[PDB]
Structure formats: structure tokens, C-alpha cells
Amino acid sequence: PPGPPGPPGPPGLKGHRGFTGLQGPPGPPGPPGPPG
Amino acid sequence: PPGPPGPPGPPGLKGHRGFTGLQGPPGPPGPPGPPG
Amino acid sequence: PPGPPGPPGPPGLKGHRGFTGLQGPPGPPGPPGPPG
């Protein structure tokens, strides 16, 4: 009779790198200014 | 005759994590200073 | 004979989005205070 099914193929390719992260939030307000 | 072709291989590995996002903007200017 | 190897597996999934960026720095010192 015919032979058995062949073996599995190679593993798939690794996925592409993820999207770059979002930008972080703006920083806090600065310190109060110098005295007048 | 030869058996039929094998099945697809296993799925690929997941992609690498994306790069970390940009540092956030500087905060706004601080309050006016105290009176002279 | 056994069949030929199967085709490659499906691609891995896209990577995770990168981490969000750092919060930005504190803002600059505020303006000088009033004269009085």
C-alpha cells in the first residue's frame, strides 16, 4: 500500500517585532520661580 | 507510492516586544515666584 | 515510502507593543515674582 503521511513541516517564522510603545506622559509643573 | 505530504509545521514563535516609547515631554513652567 | 515533509507552519504572532515611555521631567522654574 501507499506510505504513511509525511512528517510535519518546519516551524513557522517568528513574528515581527511589536509596535513601539506609546510616548510617556508630560512631566509635572516646574518649581515656583525666584522671589521678586 | 509515497504517502501524502505531511501537515503544516508548528506555529512560529511570537515576535519580540516592541521598543519602549519616547520619554514624555517636559512639564509646563512652574508658578510665578513670591513677591519681593 | 513515507510522504514528504509538510509545509512550514503559520507565522508567529506579532510581538507585544513596547512599554510606554518614561514620564517627562519636571518643567522649568516659573517666572520671577512681582516686585511687591
Residue numbers in the entry:
A (entry chain B), B (entry chain C), C (entry chain A): 1 to 36
Q: Which of the paper's sentences describe this entry?
A:
To elucidate possible binding interfaces we used an unpublished crystal structure of a collagen peptide with the sequence Ac-(POG)4LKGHRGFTGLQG-(POG)4-NH2, which resembles the C-terminal COMP binding motif of collagen II. Docking was performed with ClusPro and the best 10 models analysed by manual inspection. Furthermore, no metal ion would be necessary for this interaction. In the docked model, Asp593 of COMP form hydrogen bonds to the arginine and lysine of the middle strand and the histidine of the middle chain. Asp594 and Asp595 interact with the lysine of the middle strand. To test this model, we mutated all three aspartates to alanine residues and expressed and purified the protein. To our surprise the mutant behaved similar to the wildtype in binding assays, falsifying the proposed model. By testing a generated triple mutant replacing all three aspartate residues by alanines, we could show that this potential MIDAS motif is not involved in the binding of COMP to collagen. Close to the C-terminal propeptide, the sequence 1128GLKGHR1133 matches this consensus. Interestingly, this motif (GXKGHR) overlaps with the recognition sequence of various other collagen binders (heparin, PEDF).
